[PDB]
Amino acid sequence: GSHSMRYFYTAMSRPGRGEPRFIAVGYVDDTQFVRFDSDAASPRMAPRAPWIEQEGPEYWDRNTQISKTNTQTYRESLRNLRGYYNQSEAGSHIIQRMYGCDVGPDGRLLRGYDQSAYDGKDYIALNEDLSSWTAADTAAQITQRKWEAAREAEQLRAYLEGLCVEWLRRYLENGKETLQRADPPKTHVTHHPISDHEATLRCWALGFYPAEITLTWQRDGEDQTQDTELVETRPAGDRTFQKWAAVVVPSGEEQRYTCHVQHEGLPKPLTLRWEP
């Protein structure tokens, strides 16, 4: 179906412990494919997916240079934001930025993104028009005015409508055997007695890709969202993800509960029950 490319930048000051660290990671969908870390012995853009390794030296040199320049640009930005908030030189602060593009099955641009945070709170974001900004506060208005004077939104739109989609389509083809393959969850239902009065039913989904999944418990055909414990979807380490959903049920009522699983890799949605 549709696909995404995203870059995630983290810039972290550390007064008294050197200059701020800059980390960048790139993803296509839920697959990380590149990394950069300014603290590395010799910082370089480095591959994290096999299908990116085929890019030539010009690609690796260009993306390394951009990241080395960004290390310096984000240090300037950390200094500027400290001033915008009247903050002392003694504290550690963090800029985060996420940007990238979504394409449909035909590869057409569906939407572009550019969003930033400071110390974990929304700071400035490019609007969906790829032409205007939303600033969170009067400090971010300073950045907005600077970026409006610089026509920075126009540079983002040019990147997002051009290079972003063009390279995403290239990656999707070069990595098609994984990036365009959905792996369905392997599912089961476990039973955990709590007392003579109740037991826990837990519905498991393992080995699935991509991470998007819906796991729900129904009692008599009605969703039990308020009473369902859902763990965060978690990585297995082999590209796939895991998740579970649990509900506490009265002993003897187990067959009134059904687990429902929706995932892109399944031929059809699953309905599971405990099977003693």
Partner: peptide, 9 residues
């Protein structure tokens, strides 16, 4: 592919 030539904040 990364975006080049970012303006600082």
């Amino acid at each position: 592919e990364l975006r080049a030539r970012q303006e600082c904040y």
